[PDB]
């Protein structure tokens, strides 16, 4: 079962191991018990080269886990700017919504990743998208008094 080994290699950042496993028929879209794929794990742990390799070998850029998280939600939450750009160039849905009503914009705003917020707004992120509590990313900036984030969202 090369799928379980590919999940481990993607998380661990073993680039060579990823190439060999794919060459031997490993499922690039294998999931762990919570529905996470190799692309979700490489995007969470910041392995840019693994993300690029997987996208050139059939990884679904918009795969969701059991909680509706896409690779773009996780890269925006963790703050990996270069991976957010690579995902958007490969067709990631900028406005994907998870089970909490969050979009990647809500997660980059909460975590204070202001350069990722700018990138998402430039790629069409919806400033009116509300989470399950009715909050937009603008509401989060006003409620927490983050004036730097509020200025960017108002541009």
């Amino acid at each position: 079962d090369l799928g379980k080994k590919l999940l481990e290699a993607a998380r661990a950042g073993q680039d060579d191991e990823v190439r060999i496993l794919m060459a031997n028929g490993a499922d690039v879209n294998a999931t762990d018990a919570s529905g996470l794929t190799p692309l979700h794990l490489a995007a969470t742990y910041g392995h840019l080269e693994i993300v690029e390799v997987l996208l050139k070998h059939g990884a679904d850029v918009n795969a969701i886990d059991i909680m509706g998280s896409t690779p773009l939600h996780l890269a925006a939450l963790i703050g990996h700017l270069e991976i957010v750009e690579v995902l958007l160039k490969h067709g990631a849905d900028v406005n994907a919504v998870d089970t909490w009503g969050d979009t990647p914009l809500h997660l980059a705003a909460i975590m204070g990743h202001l350069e990722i917020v700018e990138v998402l707004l430039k790629h069409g992120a919806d400033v009116n998208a509300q989470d399950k509590f009715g909050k937009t990313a603008f509401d989060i900036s006003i409620d927490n008094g983050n004036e730097d984030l509020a200025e960017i969202l108002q541009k």
Partner: peptide
């Protein structure tokens, strides 16, 4: 409580995804 709510919201965003 504004300071505690700021940290709590960030804790919850991370914790929800078990990151």
């Amino acid at each position: 409580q504004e300071l505690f709510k700021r940290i709590s919201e960030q804790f919850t965003a991370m914790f929800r995804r078990k990151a």
